[PDB]
């Protein structure tokens, strides 16, 4: 209750010291989209949202920065690596003006690992160039740098859509009796992303940039967080639940068993649970314990029930036993139980 706010003031002492950062990751970043922009294929090239830490919410150790690549792909055909839902083969609808990606083609079919490895060609011929700081490139997010040995950067390249959301996200986001039927209209007009995760064809969808935008504007209340009456805790419960993860993560770094679990898993059953309390007094500031505990105890079921929809792609489960074993489902379980029945103390110093 007052632990859990004083764990959130704890994160901010951290998040407070970034602005030195922020600054060293955008001078890299830029000088990287000049040197892409000179490329054929890659003159397109931008990076997907613009504001400050430049995308590092995810790990909340500030060190380790997420960056994304966009380039708009236009009368692009996407073909289901069938009954998948989710990965695509990337195929070209109509040939009059030749596409310049014409190099990454695999017959019908745009290569992911062929469109990586000359993007990431690229910037690694741009890194011993660099004079000004020392980047070192690791290999195994399409390309990693570690920036004066401190700063890590990940970069993802990502194709730009602006075509209509495929098929299989219909029934997904399902934020009509929360956010309401016309703000799923308006995002759904926006364009999505394909991000290389294999089958080395093989592309995945992205919608980082609707999720940001529906966690930026999270209420039924279009003034929701934006005046002294109107504070909820969603924000506060998704930083929680993400610290969790990542305590537990480290904690049992060495054994493998959570090694499939990520803040994605946890990002998606925050906005089940959204869905499911769509109301502003259902996320009251007062009332934090509670709705930390409303996050823990719906990843619990998705856990023992082994079910975790995909929130943009309904028949997509994160939590299948072809993607997460049961035995770490189980083992999960068992950890996070033990932190709700103790009062969290894995958030203890
Ligand atoms: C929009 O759809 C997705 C977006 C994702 N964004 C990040 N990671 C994602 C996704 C997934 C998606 O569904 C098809 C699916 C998976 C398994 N992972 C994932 C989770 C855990 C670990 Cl360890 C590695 C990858
Ligand atoms: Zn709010």
Redesign the pocket.
């Known amino acids: 209750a007052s632990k859990l706010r004083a764990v959130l003031e704890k994160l901010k002492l951290s998040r407070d010291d970034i602005s030195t950062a922020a600054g060293m990751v955008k001078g890299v970043v830029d000088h990287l989209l000049l040197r892409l922009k000179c490329d054929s294929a890659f003159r397109g090239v931008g990076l997907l949202n613009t504001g400050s830490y430049y995308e590092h919410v995810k790990i909340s150790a500030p060190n380790e920065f997420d960056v994304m690549f966009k380039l708009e792909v236009p009368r692009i055909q996407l073909e289901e690596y069938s009954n998948t839902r989710?990965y695509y083969f990337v195929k070209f609808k109509r040939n009059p003006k030749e596409n310049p990606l014409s190099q990454f083609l695999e017959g019908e079919i745009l290569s992911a690992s062929k469109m990586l490895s000359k993007f990431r060609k690229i910037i690694k011929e741009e890194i011993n160039d660099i004079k000004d700081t020392d980047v070192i490139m690791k290999r195994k997010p399409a390309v990693t740098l570690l920036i004066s040995e401190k700063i890590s950067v990940d970069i993802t390249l990502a194709l730009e859509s602006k075509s209509s959301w495929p098929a299989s996200t219909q029934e997904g986001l399902r934020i009509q009796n929360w956010l309401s039927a016309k703000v799923r209209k308006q995002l759904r007009l926006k364009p999505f992303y394909l991000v290389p995760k294999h089958q080395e064809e093989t592309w995945?969808?992205?919608?980082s940039h609707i999720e940001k935008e529906i966690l930026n504007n999270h209420g039924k209340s279009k003034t929701c967080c934006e005046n002294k009456e109107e504070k909820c805790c969603r924000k506060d419960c998704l930083k929680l639940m993400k610290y969790l993860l990542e305590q537990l993560k480290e904690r049992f770094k060495d054994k493998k068993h959570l090694?499939?679990?990520?803040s994605?898993?946890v990002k998606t059953a925050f906005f089940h649970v959204c869905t499911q309390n769509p109301q502003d007094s259902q996320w009251d500031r007062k009332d934090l314990g509670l709705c930390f505990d409303n996050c823990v105890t719906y990843f619990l079921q998705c856990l023992r029930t082994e079910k975790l929809e995909?929130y943009?792609?309904p028949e997509?489960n994160?939590f299948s036993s072809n993607?997460i074993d049961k035995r770490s489902k189980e083992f999960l379980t068992k950890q996070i139980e033990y932190e709700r029945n103790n009062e969290f103390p894995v958030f203890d110093e």
Not at 204 to 207: E, G, N, Q, V
Not at 259 to 262: E, G, L, Q
């Open positions: 989710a995945r969808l992205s919608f090694d499939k679990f990520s994605y898993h995909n943009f792609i997509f994160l993607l």
